[PDB]
Amino acid sequence: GSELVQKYVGEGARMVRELFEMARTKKACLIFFDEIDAIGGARFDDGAGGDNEVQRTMLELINQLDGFDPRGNIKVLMATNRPDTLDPALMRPGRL
Amino acid sequence: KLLEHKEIDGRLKELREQLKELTKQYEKSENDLKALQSVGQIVGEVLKQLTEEKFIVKATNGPRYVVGCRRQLDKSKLKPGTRVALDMTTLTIMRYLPREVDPLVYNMSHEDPGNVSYSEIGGLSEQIRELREVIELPLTNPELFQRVGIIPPKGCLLYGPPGTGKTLLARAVASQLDCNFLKVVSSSIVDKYIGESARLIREMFNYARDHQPCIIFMDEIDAIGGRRFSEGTSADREIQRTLMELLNQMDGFDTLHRVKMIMATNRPDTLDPALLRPGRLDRKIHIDLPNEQARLDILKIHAGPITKHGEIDYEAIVKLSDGFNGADLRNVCTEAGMFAIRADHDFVVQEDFMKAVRKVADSKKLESKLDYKPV
Amino acid sequence: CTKIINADSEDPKYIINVKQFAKFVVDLSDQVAPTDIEEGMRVGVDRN
Amino acid sequence: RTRLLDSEIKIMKSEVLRVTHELQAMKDKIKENSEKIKVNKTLPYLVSNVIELLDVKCAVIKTSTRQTYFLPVIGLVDAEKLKPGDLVGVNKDSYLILETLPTEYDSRVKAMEVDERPTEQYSDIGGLDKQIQELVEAIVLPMNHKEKFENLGIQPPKGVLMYGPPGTGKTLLARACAAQTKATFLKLAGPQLVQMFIGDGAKLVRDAFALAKEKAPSIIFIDELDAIGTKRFDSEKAGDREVQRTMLELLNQLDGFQPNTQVKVIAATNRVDILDPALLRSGRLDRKIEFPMPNEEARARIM
Amino acid sequence: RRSQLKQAVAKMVQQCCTYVEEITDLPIKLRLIDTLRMVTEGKIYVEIERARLTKTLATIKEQNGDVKEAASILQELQVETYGSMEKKERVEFILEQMRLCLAVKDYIRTQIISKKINTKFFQEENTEKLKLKYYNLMIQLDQHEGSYLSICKHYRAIYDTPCIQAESEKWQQALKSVVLYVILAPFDNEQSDLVHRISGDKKLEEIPKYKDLLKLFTTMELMRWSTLVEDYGMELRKGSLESPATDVFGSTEEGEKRWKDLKNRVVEHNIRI
Numbered sequence A: 001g002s003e004l005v006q007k008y009v010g011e012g013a014r015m016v017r018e019l020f021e022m023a024r025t026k027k028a029c030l031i032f033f034d035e036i037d038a039i040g041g042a043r044f045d046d047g048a049g050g051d052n053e054v055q056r057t058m059l060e061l062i063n064q065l066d067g068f069d070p071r072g073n074i075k076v077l078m079a080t081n082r083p084d085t086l087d088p089a090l091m092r093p094g095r096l
Numbered sequence B: 001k002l003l004e005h006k007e008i009d010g011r012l013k014e015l016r017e018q019l020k021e022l023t024k025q026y027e028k029s030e031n032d033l034k035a036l037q038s039v040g041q042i043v044g045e046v047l048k049q050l051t052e053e054k055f056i057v058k059a060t061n062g063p064r065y066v067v068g069c070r071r072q073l074d075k076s077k078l079k080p081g082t083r084v085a086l087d088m089t090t091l092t093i094m095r096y097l098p099r100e101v102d103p104l105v106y107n108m109s110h111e112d113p114g115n116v117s118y119s120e121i122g123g124l125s126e127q128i129r130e131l132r133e134v135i136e137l138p139l140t141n142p143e144l145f146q147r148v149g150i151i152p153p154k155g156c157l158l159y160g161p162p163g164t165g166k167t168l169l170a171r172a173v174a175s176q177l178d179c180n181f182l183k184v185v186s187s188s189i190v191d192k193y194i195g196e197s198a199r200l201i202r203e204m205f206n207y208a209r210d211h212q213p214c215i216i217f218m219d220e221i222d223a224i225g226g227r228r229f230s231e232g233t234s235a236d237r238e239i240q241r242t243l244m245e246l247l248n249q250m251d252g253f254d255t256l257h258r259v260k261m262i263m264a265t266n267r268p269d270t271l272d273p274a275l276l277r278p279g280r281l282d283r284k285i286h287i288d289l290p291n292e293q294a295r296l297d298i299l300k301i302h303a304g305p306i307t308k309h310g311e312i313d314y315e316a317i318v319k320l321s322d323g324f325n326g327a328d329l330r331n332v333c334t335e336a337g338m339f340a341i342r343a344d345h346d347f348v349v350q351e352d353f354m355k356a357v358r359k360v361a362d363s364k365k366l367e368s369k370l371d372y373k374p375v
Numbered sequence C: 001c002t003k004i005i006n007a008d009s010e011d012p013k014y015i016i017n018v019k020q021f022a023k024f025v026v027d028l029s030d031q032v033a034p035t036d037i038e039e040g041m042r043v044g045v046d047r048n
Numbered sequence D: 001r002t003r004l005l006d007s008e009i010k011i012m013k014s015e016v017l018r019v020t021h022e023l024q025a026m027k028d029k030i031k032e033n034s035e036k037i038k039v040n041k042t043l044p045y046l047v048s049n050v051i052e053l054l055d056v057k058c059a060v061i062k063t064s065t066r067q068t069y070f071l072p073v074i075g076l077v078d079a080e081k082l083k084p085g086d087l088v089g090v091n092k093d094s095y096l097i098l099e100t101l102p103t104e105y106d107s108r109v110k111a112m113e114v115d116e117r118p119t120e121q122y123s124d125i126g127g128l129d130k131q132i133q134e135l136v137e138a139i140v141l142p143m144n145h146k147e148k149f150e151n152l153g154i155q156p157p158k159g160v161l162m163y164g165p166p167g168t169g170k171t172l173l174a175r176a177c178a179a180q181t182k183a184t185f186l187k188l189a190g191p192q193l194v195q196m197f198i199g200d201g202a203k204l205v206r207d208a209f210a211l212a213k214e215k216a217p218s219i220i221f222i223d224e225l226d227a228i229g230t231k232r233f234d235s236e237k238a239g240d241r242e243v244q245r246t247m248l249e250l251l252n253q254l255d256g257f258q259p260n261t262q263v264k265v266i267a268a269t270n271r272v273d274i275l276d277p278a279l280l281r282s283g284r285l286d287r288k289i290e291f292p293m294p295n296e297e298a299r300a301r302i303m
Numbered sequence E: 001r002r003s004q005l006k007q008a009v010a011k012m013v014q015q016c017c018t019y020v021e022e023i024t025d026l027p028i029k030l031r032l033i034d035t036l037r038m039v040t041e042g043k044i045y046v047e048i049e050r051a052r053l054t055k056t057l058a059t060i061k062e063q064n065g066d067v068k069e070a071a072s073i074l075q076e077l078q079v080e081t082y083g084s085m086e087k088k089e090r091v092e093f094i095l096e097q098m099r100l101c102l103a104v105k106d107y108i109r110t111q112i113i114s115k116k117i118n119t120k121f122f123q124e125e126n127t128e129k130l131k132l133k134y135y136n137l138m139i140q141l142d143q144h145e146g147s148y149l150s151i152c153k154h155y156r157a158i159y160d161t162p163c164i165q166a167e168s169e170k171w172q173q174a175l176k177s178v179v180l181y182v183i184l185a186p187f188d189n190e191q192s193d194l195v196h197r198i199s200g201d202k203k204l205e206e207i208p209k210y211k212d213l214l215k216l217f218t219t220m221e222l223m224r225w226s227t228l229v230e231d232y233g234m235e236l237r238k239g240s241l242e243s244p245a246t247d248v249f250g251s252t253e254e255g256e257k258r259w260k261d262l263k264n265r266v267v268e269h270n271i272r273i
């Protein structure tokens, strides 16, 4: 989870595209996003936008996960101690 | 014989035209070689004048070098804040050239349009009366106000129902004074600094001073990214501070060219009582809900760019839906056009307008995203 | 290392973004096969 | 007669001298051409777009190195031929345009187009029929004859926003529309546009809009429009300035541009609250397609 | 129904005009007053109260230019800032208010509504020259109220129409009135640039007076006033032109004041050189 957060703006979002690309190249793979809360699993997206870089990383995961062709052969396992904190779009099924 | 010789001379003339084209190619080659010698100049902005001989400047990329002027560089026109050309090796001022894309500044400049029609939604009972009268007297004669000694009223507030006088008639005032207007939405004015918003407004006021006819319009002053921030722990009333700063800018420090900074906006939820005091807000004009007979007139103005069957009773369509919004009446006309599009009719029958009015009546019943109330 | 974005007819004049430097119109090196160089392929360009 | 023939012979001698002059003009041009070829090939060519065009005949170029240079001479290529905001080939050290270069677009923009095309039906969406019809008027009617709009004088709006709770199918209408009607559908997301380098995202939005201009039947779909269109940050000094620049680029194309209805854009957001008032503006994204949570009748059909 | 009343009122104004010629002042004014009360709410769409302004103009003639009647025209015309939908005649009506203020002879009184005149602009350059014909009246009003330099500023504007007319005396007078300003106007950077611009006109060259006026324009060393009186005896009564002579020594109020000014301006010329 820490690796996905990065110093440069949206550098982590680029990594998430790579994560799916690596997943697509292998045939049938399971991705375990343990501690989903670390991967910006919330979308307050307030005017301060302190989490703006992470929020972009979270949205990039959501779109790659589902929409305009989804995982295709990827099964996603996500584990959270606090389910309530998770952002609604990720909680929505199809993604999980 | 002689005619054949003339034909041979004509062929020679054609060869001469080809020689002229070859000479043009030689001229182009000479120009290209002359061009190659020039080595370009770093583009930079003069931070300040250290001395007449040397001006401190910063290159656009970021390294800053103190530099000296070249020949007749017109140091008077080299005043700080002017883009300059810097020699690639010498790093000295070469020429004064001002070119800035200024995309955010363009939003703060003359981006706002002016509506040419005198009565787009009609409803001009005080719009071309009270609103015109207060602005016109200073605009025609600031000196007459000076003889009275009263400061010309800086601005007036068009508190009114949303859309009917807010979506429309916002730029109609520009036609009434026959000049382009500046829209103070404030979205461009508040960018990355809460404090800079007042300073950017001062820059807009200076732009307004440039045209004496142009009148500042504070349309949608509350409107901002997200929602306007009232006093709060995360964000305080920066806009309210800007309003107090605006009052200082309006009178004294920034009043010239008989330009009226009218706060003609019903968008702000709260109106400052001190602003209401004669001077900052000498008079307030209230836009009113349409009289239905007025709505019929509005529908006719909206129907003006419309192709219709001609068997149309506009009063019946107006009676069928009391939209009470100029935009809603414009919507009736557009929806009637959509009904006309169905069945491929270029003309719009009265029934199509009435069907649109029924859809508009449903839209009148259900409304969303409106959180702006004057006072 | 640099990344190719396009190719052109006749002299290829492949234009490459280094990674932060610039779009460089670099011709293929003499000891290379033109077919082997491909559009949208990472490539190594000698600076000199 | 004979004198006219003698005059033609003298002109023919001048023409022989002119052939030598043409060879000399070619030789001078060849030397400039050889330098031009070497400079484009050289590493410091730094081909990049001209920020603006100036006259004393002058150009200002921002190289990919992000350094801006003003050239007193516009360059070897014709000043009229050069277009502001168009790729131009800067000199290795002179920083003077030598060649315009072939037009090229970001690889990401090319990837966005759905060459394969989607496989969905308008019928498959259930309980959102009224919204499906509204989308058809916004996109299909401009795609079809605009003559009916022209005769009336009404203009079809360009730019559609679909706002709904996450479960409601904003993407489902978009995927079905692309499958039912083939008009160069383009995928897009607020994160995809965001890029590390400042203004790189703005180029991506501009190139995508240019691709839409290139194809007469073109639809661009941007899911999660909120990510690019976040409320403009008021963070002072250091901030995500690049993302705001990308949002401004989309606004620049939408405002006072694309009057032709050939290109239309559909955008979707889980939350419309984050979106700036500017993106909707007055006509920039006038179309709104709210997706209600499924009604009891709709739920039975959806299941 | 109000529109029907307006149609009846439009008929009333035509009837009132016929009544004005048909009957003496006491009946016609009463009839005009009766319609006026009914249309107090009604706007002056055409001559609805413009006829009332004509009626007060008539009352001024009946009352032998009574100031109160002039004041009555002044207040109603002042009220009609935007009352008349038509623009050209409405501006002309504002001029009619101004002429009555000049008739008061306060001089300031004309200036008081001259501020309202200040609002009026661009009569010249209007299509059909109809506004230009009206423009001639507005500049004509300026005289004592305009400053000696200012009278020239208006006289040059008046000069264009007579120059088009090419009248032997009126076109010559139109250029002459602007030229005579120098003698009554104090030396200034503006005065010097203006005198050079007026000087050298071919039409001005024909006039003998222009040759006399050139003495001030050039340094000309010193011009004695006594010599000038012999030179300008023609100005007092040319007998051929003398059309703009009113601008200089016309009589006493606008003439003797000009006579003192000429002595002062040449005395100022003597000290400057």
Ligand SMILES: Nc1ncnc2c1ncn2[C@@H]1O[C@H](COP(=O)(O)OP(=O)(O)OP(=O)(O)O)[C@@H](O)[C@H]1O
Pocket (backbone or CB within 6 Å): A067, A089, A092, A094, D124, D125, D126, D127, D128, D162, D163, D164, D165, D166, D167, D168, D169, D170, D171, D172, D223, D224, D268, D269, D270, D271, D291, D302
């Ligand atoms: N009326 C419907 N008929 C069929 N499927 C539907 C319907 N409404 C929603 N869906 C389902 O919703 C999903 C479509 O993705 P959806 O548009 O909900 O994603 P999203 O990006 O979260 O949307 P939004 O941007 O509107 O929040 C699919 O699982 C689809 O089957």
